[PDB]
Design a protein around this ligand. Structure first.
Ligand SMILES: Cn1cc(-c2c[nH]c3ncnc(N4CCOCC4)c23)cn1
Length: 290
């Protein structure tokens, strides 16, 4: 069965006050909501199961993976409720928004980049130690709380490694952030997330990943064919080296998340997450215009 699936007499329309749409996730739309018993804000992903076919296997896999994570770096899963044909997935609400949204008022400085990457690395180190592969690491899937806490979201394509299945070969992810071995469907592991982290580092520095102006079909030949992307522009030598470390075509040449937590870029520039409230406040003020 479905982990965290609640009783069918539990009416989620009664238990939760469904508010405004806040975005989209894998399989459905995400709404801001209120838990009517505690009055805490939650994120609610609603999936129309009637509108799905050969996607339910993937929906169940997402819920299974989320239910298995217990980390301050991964969005918490509170349970699932079925209302007629709609599945309500209750998740932790992160009021600072995605790192992608936070880039809107303008560029990040290197302290902000290093802080966000360090927290992503904490999440990846947790997942990889649990033999899990996120497979969709990008700034849109990096969420911040109102206090500046950074967490990984969207386990829609997450993979599980076992003692009998040491590697995966499925073609999954978002083209621009995909590792060459994933695109080529070669046997891959946690190192694919290290490549996606390198692309996310470029995205946090420049605002977009490499080849962002090209059609995603073109990048399916460009990524395996071309030398890896590099970070171009007036950025620190440690930041450019952090990017190059992640973005090696040879997966065994990429460091682990644990090793990257000790990279000179991180150690010299990262600061407390509480400082990221300045970034959230900037986005709030910028939105208070538009
Ligand atoms: C990709 N993804 C993020 C969540 C999610 C969980 N908690 C949230 N709190 C606040 N905002 C969110 N997002 C905002 C962006 O769109 C999507 C929902 C979320 C789910 N999937």
């Amino acid at each position: 069965g479905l982990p965290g699936m609640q009783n069918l007499k539990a009416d989620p329309e009664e238990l939760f006050t469904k508010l405004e749409k806040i975005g989209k996730g894998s399989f459905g739309e995400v709404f801001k909501g209120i838990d009517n018993r505690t009055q805490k804000v939650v994120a609610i992903k609603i999936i129309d199961l009637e509108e799905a076919e050969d996607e339910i296997e993937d929906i169940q896999q997402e819920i299974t993976v989320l239910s298995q994570c217990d980390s301050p770096y991964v969005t918490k899963y509170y349970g699932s409720y079925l209302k007629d044909t709609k599945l309500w997935i209750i998740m932790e609400y992160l009021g600072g928004g995605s790192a992608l949204d936070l880039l809107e008022p303008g560029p990040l400085d290197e302290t902000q980049i290093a802080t966000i990457l360090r927290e992503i690395l904490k999440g990846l180190d947790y997942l990889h130690s649990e033999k899990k592969i996120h497979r969709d690491i990008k700034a849109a899937n990096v969420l911040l709380s109102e206090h500046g806490e950074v967490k990984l979201a969207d386990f829609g394509v997450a993979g599980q490694l076992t003692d009998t299945q040491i590697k995966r070969n499925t073609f999954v992810g978002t083209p621009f952030w995909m590792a060459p071995e994933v695109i080529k469907q070669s046997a891959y592991d946690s190192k694919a997330d290290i490549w996606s982290l390198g692309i996310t580092a470029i995205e946090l520095a420049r605002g977009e990943p490499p080849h962002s102006e090209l059609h995603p079909m073109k990048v399916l030949f460009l990524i395996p064919k071309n030398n890896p992307p590099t970070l171009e522009g007036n950025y620190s030598k440690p930041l450019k080296e952090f990017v190059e470390a992640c973005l090696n075509k040879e997966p065994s040449f990429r460091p682990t998340a644990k090793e990257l937590l000790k990279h000179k870029f991180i150690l010299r520039n990262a600061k407390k997450t509480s400082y990221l409230t300045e970034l959230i406040d900037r986005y709030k003020r910028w939105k208070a215009e538009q």
